[PDB]
Amino acid sequence: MADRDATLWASHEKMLSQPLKDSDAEVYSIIKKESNRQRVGLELIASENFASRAVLEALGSSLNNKYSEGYPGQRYYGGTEFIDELEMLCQKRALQAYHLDPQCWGVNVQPYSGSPANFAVYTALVEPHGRIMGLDLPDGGHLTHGFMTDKKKISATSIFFESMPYKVYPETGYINYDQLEENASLFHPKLIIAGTSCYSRNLDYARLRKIADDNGAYLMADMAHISGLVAAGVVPSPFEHCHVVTTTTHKTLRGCRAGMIFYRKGVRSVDPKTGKETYYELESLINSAVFPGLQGGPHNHAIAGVAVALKQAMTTEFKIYQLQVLANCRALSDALTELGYKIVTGGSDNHLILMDLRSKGTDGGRAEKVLEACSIACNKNTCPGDKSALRPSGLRLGTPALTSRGLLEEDFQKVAHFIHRGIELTLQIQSHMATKATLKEFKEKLAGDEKIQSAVATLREEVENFASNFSLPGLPDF
Amino acid sequence: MADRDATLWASHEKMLSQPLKDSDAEVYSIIKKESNRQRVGLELIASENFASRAVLEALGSSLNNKYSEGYPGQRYYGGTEFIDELEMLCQKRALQAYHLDPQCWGVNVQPYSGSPANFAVYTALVEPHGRIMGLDLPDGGHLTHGFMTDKKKISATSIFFESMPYKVYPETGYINYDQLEENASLFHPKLIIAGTSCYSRNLDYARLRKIADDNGAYLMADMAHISGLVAAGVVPSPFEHCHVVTTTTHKTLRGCRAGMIFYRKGVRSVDPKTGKETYYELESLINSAVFPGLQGGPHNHAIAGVAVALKQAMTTEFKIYQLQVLANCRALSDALTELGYKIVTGGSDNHLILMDLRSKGTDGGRAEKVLEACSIACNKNTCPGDKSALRPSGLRLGTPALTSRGLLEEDFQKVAHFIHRGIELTLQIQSHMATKATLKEFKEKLAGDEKIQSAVATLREEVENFASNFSLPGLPDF
Amino acid sequence: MADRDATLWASHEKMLSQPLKDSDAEVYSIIKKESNRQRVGLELIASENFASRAVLEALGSSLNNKYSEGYPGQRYYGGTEFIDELEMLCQKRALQAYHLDPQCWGVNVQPYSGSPANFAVYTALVEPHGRIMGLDLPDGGHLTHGFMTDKKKISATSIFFESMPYKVYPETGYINYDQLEENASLFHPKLIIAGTSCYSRNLDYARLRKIADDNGAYLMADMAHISGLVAAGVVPSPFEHCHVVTTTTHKTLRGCRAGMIFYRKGVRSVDPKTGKETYYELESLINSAVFPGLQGGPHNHAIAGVAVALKQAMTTEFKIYQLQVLANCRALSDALTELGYKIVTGGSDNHLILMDLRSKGTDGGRAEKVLEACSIACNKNTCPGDKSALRPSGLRLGTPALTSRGLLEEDFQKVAHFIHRGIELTLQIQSHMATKATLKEFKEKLAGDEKIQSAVATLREEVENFASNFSLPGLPDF
Amino acid sequence: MADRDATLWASHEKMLSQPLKDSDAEVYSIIKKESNRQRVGLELIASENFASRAVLEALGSSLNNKYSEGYPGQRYYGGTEFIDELEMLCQKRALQAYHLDPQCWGVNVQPYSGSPANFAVYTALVEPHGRIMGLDLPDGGHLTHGFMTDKKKISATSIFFESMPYKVYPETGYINYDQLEENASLFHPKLIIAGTSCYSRNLDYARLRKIADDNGAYLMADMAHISGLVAAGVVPSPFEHCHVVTTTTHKTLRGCRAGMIFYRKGVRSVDPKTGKETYYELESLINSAVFPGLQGGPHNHAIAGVAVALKQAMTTEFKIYQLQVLANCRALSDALTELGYKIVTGGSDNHLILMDLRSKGTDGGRAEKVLEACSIACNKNTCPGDKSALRPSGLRLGTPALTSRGLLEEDFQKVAHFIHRGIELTLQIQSHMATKATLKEFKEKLAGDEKIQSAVATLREEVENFASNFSLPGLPDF
Numbered sequence A, B, C, D: 001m002a003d004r005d006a007t008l009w010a011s012h013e014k015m016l017s018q019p020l021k022d023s024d025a026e027v028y029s030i031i032k033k034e035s036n037r038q039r040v041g042l043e044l045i046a047s048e049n050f051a052s053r054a055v056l057e058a059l060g061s062s063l064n065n066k067y068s069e070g071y072p073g074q075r076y077y078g079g080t081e082f083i084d085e086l087e088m089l090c091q092k093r094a095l096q097a098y099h100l101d102p103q104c105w106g107v108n109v110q111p112y113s114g115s116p117a118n119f120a121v122y123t124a125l126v127e128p129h130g131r132i133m134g135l136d137l138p139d140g141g142h143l144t145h146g147f148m149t150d151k152k153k154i155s156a157t158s159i160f161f162e163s164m165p166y167k168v169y170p171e172t173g174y175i176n177y178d179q180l181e182e183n184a185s186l187f188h189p190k191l192i193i194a195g196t197s198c199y200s201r202n203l204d205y206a207r208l209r210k211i212a213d214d215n216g217a218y219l220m221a222d223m224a225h226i227s228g229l230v231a232a233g234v235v236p237s238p239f240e241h242c243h244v245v246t247t248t249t250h251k252t253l254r255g256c257r258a259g260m261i262f263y264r265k266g267v268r269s270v271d272p273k274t275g276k277e278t279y280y281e282l283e284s285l286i287n288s289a290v291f292p293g294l295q296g297g298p299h300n301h302a303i304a305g306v307a308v309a310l311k312q313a314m315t316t317e318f319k320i321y322q323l324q325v326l327a328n329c330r331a332l333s334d335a336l337t338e339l340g341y342k343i344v345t346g347g348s349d350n351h352l353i354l355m356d357l358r359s360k361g362t363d364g365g366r367a368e369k370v371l372e373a374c375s376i377a378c379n380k381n382t383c384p385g386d387k388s389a390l391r392p393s394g395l396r397l398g399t400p401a402l403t404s405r406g407l408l409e410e411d412f413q414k415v416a417h418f419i420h421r422g423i424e425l426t427l428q429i430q431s432h433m434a435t436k437a438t439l440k441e442f443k444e445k446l447a448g449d450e451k452i453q454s455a456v457a458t459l460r461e462e463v464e465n466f467a468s469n470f471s472l473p474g475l476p477d478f
Ligand SMILES: Nc1nc(=O)c2c([nH]1)N=C[C@H](CNc1ccc(C(=O)N[C@@H](CCC(=O)O)C(=O)O)cc1)N2CO
Pocket: A069, A076, A292, B137, B138, B139, B140, B141, B142, B143, B144, B147, B154, B197, B198, B379, B381, B382, B388, B389, B390
């Protein structure tokens, strides 16, 4: 009677302004339990990191409500005056952050994430069944770089395109550029990918470029893992030799989840005596493949977040962070080698390293699970071999996460020891049941048991105590 | 003493905890300018809406920092104990919200958005060059349902798959199920799509299902535009006849941007031959196509947001909101018909309506631009009887956005008049110029190029005054 | 160097000059047994005919020994001076025989046969997965026009390309050009095929052409069955509206087995007011498809045979033969209708007719077998809306074969009666068992057991006596 | 029809029985001019040969008139009782000739020619876009073993399938089986091809088979060039290791133009702990591929010819001919090496050899043309190493043709000298021309230069006189 459905319309009213803390206590609980986990634990996962409060604060903005399907050129909707400001600002900051002359480069900040950015480029430049060459998955390449096997096609890339990988010399762990140049002549790639998910050395963009032009193919760099190191100038930039560069904005770049596609324009090629010229049409093809080719409406709130992180990436505080990141890696790789473990290719040139546990009877699958039980998060990355995912032989460690929390060399050494203690434990428990049972049973004396869990319980504690003593970027604990 | 270095580390320290308001004033400015826009304006874009504070508050959580590439049970990284809680909770709430027996249904809450969800299904069930049938784009169907022309394939869908559309009787605006059944026999679709972006009537899932089984194809519903109306029970659910149902979580569902894939699981095909069964393998194929097939790591923070919105969708305050949404549509469609405009199919069964401005000499392209200048977000739309695309003959209006702000019938009538005044103005300004006038020229004379901007300026005001008097869901003050 | 350079080399010497009669008595026997069969029997198979002695005489020439892989332009071999004469002469006579201006038309006389010629064109103009539209198989089309299923893609055409058929109004048996125009707009064919293997009426090339240009597709005619009637001028030529015309050189053209591809050239269309003239590139694409595309070295001996038959086709003796061929058809269709049988579309406009035995309880499968047992050649073709094959309700009869042997109207009437007697017999042998008995139950109980193979034996005789009284073209008894 | 037309019926009557000599004097003239050419000339083209009279005599039989679309025991026409005899007899003789147990092997004698046979197998076993590995064209491979530039795919094989070649050590001219095994692991071929058009050594079927099974692919042998040598037993048979063997029936088999597809059958499975018994399915797939898949109606007259040649291949006169063929090769390769020319791989194991004219400043292109002018059928062919491609470096010589005419060692030496004299002449006409070659220029001078055509005229004579002194298989003066 209080003007109809009075009661409910009042509720529905509050429900849309009520805080998460009240609206959904269950989801609220989980988020805090997770925030906590990240605080009292050692994140050594190469691809993870902690986003600044500034970035996150933009993710939950009103931008999440606007549809702007086109481009700052022609949109399929109205009221994009501000979204247009935002999009162009981010595009501007993107080219800046990587010291790119807007006359020769352009960007697309609409890819929902990394994988999407890549598929978008193959779609634009390779076309259905077109040939692509990438670094084999177990050799350091990425799923989206064309990943298949003798029997199954795992990646969408190898499904809609024809892929063939190149390898690393098992002997030294370095990319075998000689075999690549050889095979490229027989396969005729239409695009070659220079990017990795687990390679601790720099890429010879120079030589790759040569091979690419030799077979008249595009050279695309997927600098996802080093987007930050590159923007900071601490490592060699792929923008000197590649025609296209894709990337995620999280990881070493410390932004929110998204992807970008950098592409060359105009000044393509020059003819000697034949003095005729050729141009780049990348901008046209790529922008279209993204939309309406593959995506719907851009996620303006994510783009806002990226713009924020891009700005931060241009600071000196950033350039120094990234430097510490590299330094910390050496520290950890040295202390670890010193402790007597095998580090592929000897060491690292970037932010990650790969351990070959093989020279210890233990595999990466077991070791990974133990370290987890002790608040030490990482990857059971695949080794330069032919075994297979889910039960590898090496571990992948990264430093961006922890460096962002303060940790310096001395601390990373203490970390090294914690890890040593962990594998130490793994070897023990291995024999305390010495048989032919797989991981699924390993979860037993681990999960259940108790006497074995008294060891972990101790180490986990010393670790969590060590961890909790550092800062944790983000909101007011949430 | 140790200034030199530790002096900076103090900055980098604050930079990661400093509020957006300080960190990036530029981006902060834009966000507020945009928040404002949404406040003092009439959002009539069928696919837009305002997300609750609860949802948004979850988007900028720590979840944005975790990598969990696999699925609960077997992930590729560790420390997913909580992400697992979250993911399973959301999957649980998803099946609940749509009253689905977890014995016969399953979900995937990892698709980054709507389009991605769909491509994932075609990838899983159709396979390269497989045949797909959808509602032609200009007939109310959506881009990803297959869209191609005489020379160029547009939607990634028609690029990697072989598509052919079905139509609506131009005479009445209803889907011509008879022609569909006819063509399906000659084309042999492998999957048929029942979903729209601009159709004001319910779909005959029952008949579509018949046609699907007749040709032994899958029936997939893309209930993006009606996800909310369906969850609320106000309209017929596609879950009774479809094998698979995909959807966006924004729009009538009022959540954050993302997508979901619902699929049947269990036994299909009694096999009146012998005591032999036949099962559904959708879960297996779809889950794999999503990952490692097409996507990288799930965006856990978006999933959190979805879970929050799902909960809200199950409330009575929601069921009532959705009811008002429908009611408001009729009101607007009546007041508009009453004013003498043509509404395709006569009216609406859902939350949107399509105006045929053709019976007024003006097209949707011009009219859309004028209404924008008056703080009335529209959206032009292709339609029955010729398709110019981007320069259609109709306007698409929706009510979810404004209903979420309070607006009731009386208010939507006042809205109708505002719109009438707008097209009124368009007709005027048209007449007063060259009969060989371009749209870009129209856009000129509309610019500050007249006493006509004095007309718009007046209407814009009366509109913004009317608007600003209603609530606007979201974050109180950043 | 003993019984070698004496014995073995003398034998090997003779073996290569020794006549077939001695060299291989087995094969020699079979050939004569077959020559005989053709003499004492009524060949009513629409696609068969008897080649002149002149033609055959060239098939076994020395030409069978030369390799000339390229074209008269440039080959890849030497000593093609004469093969070049031959090839160009044949190409010359081909354009003459069909009154084609060499300025607008060109030919390729290298296709090994009919099917090859077609695939060659699709390969050249359609490209992998390109769309093609043809007359459904059971509606009157040929496998090469693409033939698939909801279960499997059968023909090579529907395997490497994307095909969709058009139909005939089951009610009248005429091609439903209205539905074709309708579907072509939704499917977007890249090429449309106008040709049949079992249609007794002329094709509306004029309207087909309209539809093709409407969707900007190529119109290809496969005049295999009417190559002769067309060259002779007795029926409408497809060369007036089609862009490409393929054909077999046997059947109504009475040559040896092979195929040809006729294509347009020079000025495809001039822009409205822009001097820019679009040109025909068919010659280039097609010639390359044949070689080095799909074929190896041309079969020069077959080409020689074709050249001979082409010359004969331009005679008056030919023009008259073809006239009698048509006449004879009417005669047979009339006498047959008169006898009370159903002839699809009422009659014929060409050299063949299709009987609907359905209105007699018997199917084409049974009837065909009976008539065979009586030295009468058939084709149990399907019929308009046959409720499935396996039980085709029709028989396909042609007159070119027998007309070439002398037979005139009076004789074809006597033929009609022989046929009547045959089906008559079928019904009988069918009438007593007349149950769900399979065609195999009939197949057997027929010639199988019941000693009334005494009935067939009688009819077979009266037929063979009637037959053996006519001439039989060819070589002096082979 | 009265007296009006009936006259001509007498002509039309004769026209069909009149001899080619009268019917078409033009074509008759050409055939004799060509028969002559072959008589007074040295045919050194590796892929050519002269067919026996027995074979040719069957080509122009009545069989050219019958349609028998299906297979024996499953046709779609009637009156195939004799065609069935013929087809089965040929299939029988095929398995005999190669000492194949009909329990483990089967054949298809319907492929119109070599290329067709191959495409048929890829179509049946590889399927669209399936991967295939063959010997690179310039290293000794054939056009249908795949061939594609980096700008476009030439052979139909590389167009409808995904191909990648393997090579020969340019240093020694032998196939690099080590690289093949290497690449096969990275490419995952679905089928590997073991066959050549220009390789003078035997193939390691044994090793190839290993590699094939390693990657679980089919090993197909294309023994076109050695079909005869193999049937005769003079060289190693591929039937010991390959799953499928295709071939042409002309060339080293001295039959008429056609092809055959040999395939394994019955069992070849059983593994687990339970006797599997998976059997081969090649017969099923291949036979269907050929029909209704790719071909129309078989060319029964060609099949007859093949059957005749198969019989002849099983004689001792044949086994001896083939032995002489091999012997003659050595003779020619020795006399040629002796004269100081380079023979790739040193010599030959079969019927052909490849000359590397590179070590003489002259290329195969020029040399070929000169030798032609002197009644010597040669053939340029790139050899391992030269980037050239357009500037060959080699000549391919074969002995089957001339051996079939009687020629023995002594004669082949005289031949060697004639060739020497020829290249000798080439150098001359070439060692006095600018420097920036251009064969466009060489072939120019070649014709007009008196001195030069007086030289050729002399050699041509001595050659033609030498030639005309030998027998020439085939019908009398045809
Ligand atoms: N009924 C409807 N269907 C839709 O999919 C659609 C619509 N409403 N509402 C607005 C948006 C965006 N609409 C679009 C419509 C067409 C093109 C498009 O194909 N553009 C062409 C232009 C050239 C031409 O017309 O030939 C291109 O080539 O890019 C893109 C987006 N949208 C919901 O996604």
